[PDB]
Design a protein around this ligand. Sequence first.
Ligand SMILES: *Cc1c(COP(=O)(O)O)cnc(C)c1O
Ligand SMILES: *Cc1c(COP(=O)(O)O)cnc(C)c1O
Ligand SMILES: *Cc1c(COP(=O)(O)O)cnc(C)c1O
Ligand SMILES: *Cc1c(COP(=O)(O)O)cnc(C)c1O
Lengths: 396, 396, 396, 396
Amino acid sequence: SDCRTYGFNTQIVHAGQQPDPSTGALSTPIFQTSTFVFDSAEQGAARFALEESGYIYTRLGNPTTDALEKKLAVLERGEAGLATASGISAITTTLLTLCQQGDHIVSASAIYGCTHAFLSHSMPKFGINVSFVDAAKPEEIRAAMRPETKVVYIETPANPTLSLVDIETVAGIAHQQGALLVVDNTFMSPYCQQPLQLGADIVVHSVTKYINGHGDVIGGIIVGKQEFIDQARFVGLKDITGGCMSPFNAWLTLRGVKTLGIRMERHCENALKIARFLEGHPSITRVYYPGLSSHPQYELGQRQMSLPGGIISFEIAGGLEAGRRMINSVELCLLAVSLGDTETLIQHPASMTHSPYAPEERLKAGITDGLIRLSVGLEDPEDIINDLEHAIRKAT
Amino acid sequence: SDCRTYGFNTQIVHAGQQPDPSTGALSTPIFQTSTFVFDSAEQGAARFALEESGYIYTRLGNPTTDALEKKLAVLERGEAGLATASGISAITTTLLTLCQQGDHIVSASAIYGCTHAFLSHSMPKFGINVSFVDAAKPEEIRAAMRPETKVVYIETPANPTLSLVDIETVAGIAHQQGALLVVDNTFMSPYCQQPLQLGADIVVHSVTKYINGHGDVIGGIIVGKQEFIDQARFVGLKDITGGCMSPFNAWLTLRGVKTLGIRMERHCENALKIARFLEGHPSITRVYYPGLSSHPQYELGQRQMSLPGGIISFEIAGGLEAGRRMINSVELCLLAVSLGDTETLIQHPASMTHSPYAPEERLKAGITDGLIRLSVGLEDPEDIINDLEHAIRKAT
Amino acid sequence: SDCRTYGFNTQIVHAGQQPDPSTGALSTPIFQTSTFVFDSAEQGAARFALEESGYIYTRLGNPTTDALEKKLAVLERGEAGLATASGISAITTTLLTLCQQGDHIVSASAIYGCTHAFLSHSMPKFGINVSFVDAAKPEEIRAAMRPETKVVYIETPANPTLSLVDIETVAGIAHQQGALLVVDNTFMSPYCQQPLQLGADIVVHSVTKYINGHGDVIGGIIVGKQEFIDQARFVGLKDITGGCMSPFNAWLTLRGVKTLGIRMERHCENALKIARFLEGHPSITRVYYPGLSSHPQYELGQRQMSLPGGIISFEIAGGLEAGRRMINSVELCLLAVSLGDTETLIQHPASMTHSPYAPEERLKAGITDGLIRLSVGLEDPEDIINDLEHAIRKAT
Amino acid sequence: SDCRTYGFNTQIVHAGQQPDPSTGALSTPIFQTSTFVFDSAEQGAARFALEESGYIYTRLGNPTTDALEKKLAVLERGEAGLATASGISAITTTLLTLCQQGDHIVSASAIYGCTHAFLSHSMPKFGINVSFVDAAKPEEIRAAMRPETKVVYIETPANPTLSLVDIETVAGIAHQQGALLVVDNTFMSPYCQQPLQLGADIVVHSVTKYINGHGDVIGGIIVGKQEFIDQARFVGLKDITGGCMSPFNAWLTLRGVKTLGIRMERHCENALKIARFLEGHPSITRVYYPGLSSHPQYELGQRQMSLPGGIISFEIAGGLEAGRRMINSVELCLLAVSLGDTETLIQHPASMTHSPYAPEERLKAGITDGLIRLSVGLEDPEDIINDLEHAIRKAT
Ligand SMILES: *Cc1c(COP(=O)(O)O)cnc(C)c1O
Ligand SMILES: *Cc1c(COP(=O)(O)O)cnc(C)c1O
Ligand SMILES: *Cc1c(COP(=O)(O)O)cnc(C)c1O
Ligand SMILES: *Cc1c(COP(=O)(O)O)cnc(C)c1O
């Protein structure tokens, strides 16, 4: 049969995978090899000429990684996938394949910090200019487009305030002006949002977050048309970034993604409960969560996202010192800077990642002094709420 | 004590490593994690401000990978190391950290094919121009230097004819003209050649070859001054290539490198025997091996290399068809395109990697129709010789 | 705090685990080591004398495996855990620690086939006699008890007809007669049944099934009182079976168990839907599933099990040939002999595992000619039902 | 061709292994699976009936582990191999397959401590009696034989004094009296001693030591006739010990064994240098090493062993307190209780493993107060000697 025909949970479990043909092994074997052996000179030449399918060398391609690439292509409804060493490598392999000196990119300003650093500081040194705009306002995207614009780049939801971008509307604007739309879908995973179905051309993820979900893999994935992915593989990865994924990391990500549907359901069920608790707490001034009807783009989120996500941000009364006291008072939530793990993770940017920055520079990343970012895990939500209540009460 | 004080075999085993402090575990633990947890807001801020040692997130740094980086820095007599997703990523993370639009690179022409593709086709699209020269002639390096030249880039020995480059002489030329010298030391490993001791500024390796040695890791390493490595880590890797190494791959490379000294001794003992056998064979027109006194740069090799290496190239009588017949007639040597594995690997480029290319285009990579490339493994050399003799006899 | 105080999902995620003390790594490091190093002669002696905590050698104990042992002890409400190379090793390490020549065991007859082979053929050759009884009838257990009986051994539910054993009632009988009760809890996992809370003394699992859940680990676990577990570790494992678990297998099982709660919820939701579909199908003569009210011990199952499980057996009309045709006609369910994986697995014992046996010998394992065993996975239940309907329709 | 025809180093690299048939991957894939899938009911039945080759379930057999089993069978010149969870499991799976209540074993007294504990305390509780003899005196073996003796069990060399057993002579005695000879060949590895070639029936190893060689695997192997190995697999392992090896551990051992020849050569070259240094040191009363001509069985060792090994024991002047001071004064040698790793390991049993024992009880394991045991690693021997000289000088 064809796995593209089954339901989404069935695809999560099975797409891109099948029992090993020589042994019947059910788990995808870990092809932890660099070298592949040819049966003859002619078989080697046939593979190098693309006249025969098969493998050559793990930087170019590998059976374990191929399974992950095919699975994620199915889940995003794209033609082809390309696994990478990190989410950053997925982003930069994509953009360095597409762009050359003299080209231009229109990017959302509300993007992952290291992506912003790449676009702000590294791209212009290669002659590739970037204009940053508020992508919640599609007119600002249009106004920033130039004859040289090759790419519009967006993230949605966008940390740390969980604002949204209207993918379908932005895709139409980008395409009318001759540009590709690249969407970083890390926050949602394909279980909750499908940018290619809304007109995006390329989707990138850090699999480090929800796709792997177990806090033990750094990796990325790119999904798009075969013609583009082939260039991203044989030029961007092979020559430019060298950012190939280890077969063992691909195997762990295949293993983690098996539970993506059930994990996202529980992350989001837990997060909605915690978000409602925080919205009712008189020591919490604001709660940013797409599942609360007061979210400024709530209706867009309901049309574009099948679930409101596992991430919450909120502001605690009392600013910087209260946020520091609160984060130093949790006993179950763990202080860390990643997200999408099975454990609940918490961070206070103004006292952690952005401490030696001026308050007006911190807002440039949307960071207020009392802002706390919470990645909701798979624990009992009552335990998470009790921990938050205990810490908030102490802090205020 | 200080491991930088012990003998080289002792350093191979011990440098960069020690029993785990919390448990005493002798093997370096596999810190297969993405996330690291802070004990307090203040500890997180201290790490982000570089005011406290410790870890944050595996793309930035990891204890397992740190051990590999420190070991390879000791072995190359460099200050610091940076592990990468691939040898290509080591090369491009280095050059994309050092160079920006308007800069220039002087490169040897006799370099790894994918490095050549990066330099020929990708660098100029970022405004970084490259002049290729015959680096066996240091005067051609000097003549190609421009005010904008930031880097001279060399490999030695250089596949597929095993020609050499005089590292010390080229380093002096590069430095007099204000450029850094980057040496790809993959072929030799630090056990056989130490470019930093001869004046190079930066050494890169594909650990995929001899350093790991077991044919099961794609990876790279960069070694140089702390100031440069810090930029390669926090800009080149973090932002540009995203080419971080998986902790499991670092652990496998640590494990492989434990036997680097004994492996290189056996590879080179075997290769010298096989090279002498081939040089005495009337069906073999030429043998390229630094350990044969007829090698055109033999004396330079004796001063610069402690052993002549594990790689041999040779030309079989009868050109393309004889090379194809020979490679299709081996029974022990394995047909493949990597090198530095414990198994003997063999390839015939004119019928394998470069078949759909014109004979005059193949020479542009030094490839004649009868040229065979042999990576000598750890088998009994008598068995390798018998296999080669059987195949040569059949082919001719 | 104490993790034994949190909710069960919180314990699944966190019990037995914490950030690495020397680095903060969130994932439990893979301590893939044999050797541990002492700081002094005195520290080595202190560990060998049990006068100091810490590690010596991985066969005796290991930090990664210790985390798994502690987690499973928390989840089963037992004092201590011991990980093993396989479920069989958990069973035999337990029984060979407890029993010596002249001792006796009363065992259920409806037990895992290889356990039955150990008890029937291997135990008596060591002078340890075994009486098999129908453990659904607690009076048969009582009647089989002898002065030499050390252990009553049961599984519940019991494959392949999913009959039950009343743990609390059997525990009272065993204890009144001076014997320990050992329960194999593999089928249910601690998420669905807690034998120690009902009076059992020792729980064993094959973690190969639901606890790991990902079809990529063979392993076992024993949970019980510290005094017994210490004997199982330092005599049974150290000396008798040698069945220690690899640190990597323990790490994978820790990783798999993170999703145990959400997996069991989905397995059982899916299984109840499929069981009801099969019970309404006129080509299916019988359906064995604890969640159907027609199950002969339905009310006991509701008191003893929090969910009815992920396993279903059923009889297809037409006996042996229909069962063979049906199993050869599924397109999504995979033909295999394990259970508890994320993929739906199916087997027809009369044509697969028990084909060269007489029909009257097959019933001795409860196997009728039309009996099919289904391990329900995490796919969309509609897809599983459609596959079963297609295959049943073709077969009948 | 047939790998049993190549030289021993070629076999170390290649025996039991070949490129993956479906992909050409050179490294043996890690078949980290529990479940295997059948294409039809008939294929499942054919495998269960042994009428078709192939896999069923990893406890029974696995492609990665099969490669290791076949390689070690080739290296020991035996018919078949069986991998296990530990060296202890190799020993007990063997003996519990061969023996039942009423049987008898004649064992050397100079054996590994946990093997001695199994034979002394556990075997008799299963009705299997054991007589311990000085196996350096073959007449004591003969005199201890009884009508019920099934097995003669020996280790050679034997820790901690490195005494020897004449394998060929003992095999002839055992066979004349109708018993099998089992030899634990862990100390030597097949590179240095081949008991089956000298008449032994079964060889066991802890692969934890030299075969893996990297201090990161606990595991065992059994090698013998196909008829016996089949019983050890399908009864001893399947039913009794459950001591199967994890596929990942088998893959690591395959990887470690690739360098067995070059490692043993260097271990033994280093050990002979260190042994000669110790024999010339006036603070060292005795040196136990088969490569010193003063060894009491030196000539037997030269006939039976191709190299004298990597292990040395020696007595330091001043007894218990000097041994403790010496071991607390090394800076490079690591204090630990395993052997065969790439790092040099050292232990002082009288102050470490046997401290709370009476001096007359310590001699029962051949342990004098000043006895030090050294596992010589791959470091520069000059560095090891300097470390030992520094520590000896301080201690005396
Ligand atoms: C973490 C993250 C990234 C970067 O991925 P890495 O795997 O850390 O390189 C990119 N985008 C988003 C939205 C992320 O959360
Ligand atoms: C193989 C090789 C490389 C590339 O390294 P990868 O690990 O394949 O990316 C670079 N230089 C040399 C000399 C090589 O042999
Ligand atoms: C599979 C199973 C076992 C055996 O465990 P292994 O890990 O295969 O050794 C024991 N009991 C039950 C109920 C099982 O399903
Ligand atoms: C270490 C050893 C063993 C035991 O093997 P494990 O892998 O630790 O179970 C048995 N025999 C000898 C000679 C050993 O050195």
